[PDB]
Design a protein around this ligand. Structure first.
Ligand SMILES: Cc1ccc(S(=O)(=O)N2C[C@H]3C[C@H](C(=O)NCc4ccc(Cl)cc4Cl)C[C@H]3C2)cc1
Length: 320
């Protein structure tokens, strides 16, 4: 029920960061620059309820299509989607727009990106906020695979490793894909914890799922249209750089995040659980917190009013 966005009525921007890589964004508002970075497998449009509210609150909002998504380039090579490359391209993005800094707010994979922007490019990050995704320092003595085996919470990510396997499932029926994923906690039709065992996300879920209370048919169809452009290889490639990302992260151990930071947890996200964020204060002294009850993984569309309230209070206080 907050004001949403009609894609045709937005300003659409395009920056070529590298010869074969152009990033698309939508832009609304005047004021301090706030760059919104979505998760997997989402869109700029995942911020549809935030963009008007933040603009109305006196910010210049730039909502990205992240690399691999929507109208942004989606090269096929896996290494184009490591965190080092993605962060270097976000800095390039700011350079070509002529922005010395922005506030970076991310969700899910985008949350992980904004943490590594805060860590490796603090001079370009005015303040940083994550929805659901915690910041956890790399362990230089535990490989990613060892980390999955040891504690198999994220073991669905093994299904995403082999190029072509998860793509065939997710691209088979895009409407079913998005209707199956984009649900409230209590409406779930699949368990991310059971993916490995079953050999897929939707192997035991309805062929024709109902529409979640969170989304309309027209909203689903927007995602469908966006993912017809490049499909799921680029999006999935975000998961296929585990060793590279771990090595890069290990180069930063010990250094803290001292810029203003906000961590927002979601009570009913059963993958990125609130408890994963405990002790972040040890590495982020200037850490503020928020929490949303009755809120699952799809934070922005499950509880948009609460997200908007939290982000605007924090922005008005600690990033301005
Ligand atoms: C330093 C570092 C640590 C961990 C990592 S990680 O382990 O690779 N991963 C954890 C986060 C969780 C994820 C993600 O998989 N989100 C899809 C998702 C979630 C819930 C639901 Cl219900 C449904 C769906 Cl499709 C994106 C993030 C990256 C990387 C780097």
């Amino acid at each position: 029920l907050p004001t949403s966005c009609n894609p045709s009525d937005m300003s659409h921007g395009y920056v070529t960061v590298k010869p074969r890589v152009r990033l698309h964004f939508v832009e609304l508002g005047s004021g301090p620059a706030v760059c919104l970075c979505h998760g997997f497998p989402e869109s700029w449009y995942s911020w549809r309820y935030q963009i008007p509210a933040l603009a109305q609150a006196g910010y210049r909002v730039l909502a990205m299509d992240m690399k691999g998504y929507g109208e942004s380039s989606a090269p096929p090579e896996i290494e184009e989607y490591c965190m080092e490359v993605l962060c270097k391209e976000m800095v390039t993005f700011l350079d070509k727009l002529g922005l010395s800094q922005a506030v970076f707010i991310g969700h899910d994979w985008g949350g992980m990106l904004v943490w590594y922007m805060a860590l490796f490019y603090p001079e370009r990050v005015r303040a940083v906020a994550s929805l659901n995704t915690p910041f956890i320092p790399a362990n230089p003595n535990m490989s990613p695979l060892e980390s999955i085996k040891a504690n198999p919470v994220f073991d669905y990510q093994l299904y995403f490793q082999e190029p072509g396997v998860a793509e065939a499932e997710l691209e088979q029926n895009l409407s079913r894909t998005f209707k199956s994923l984009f649900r409230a906690s209590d409406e779930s039709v699949l368990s991310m914890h059971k993916v490995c065992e079953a050999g897929g996300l939707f192997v035991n879920s309805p062929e024709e799922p109902s529409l979640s209370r969170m989304v309309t048919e027209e909203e689903i169809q927007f995602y469908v249209q966006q993912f017809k452009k490049s499909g799921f290889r680029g999006p999935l490639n975000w998961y296929r750089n585990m060793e590279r990302n771990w090595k890069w992260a290990c180069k930063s151990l010990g250094r803290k995040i001292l810029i203003p930071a906000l961590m927002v947890t979601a009570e009913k996200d059963f993958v990125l659980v609130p408890q994963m964020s405990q002790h972040m204060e040890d590495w982020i002294p200037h850490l503020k917190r928020g929490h949303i009850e009755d809120c699952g993984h799809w934070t922005q569309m499950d509880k948009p009013t609460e997200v908007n309230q939290i982000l605007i209070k924090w922005l008005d206080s600690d990033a301005r």
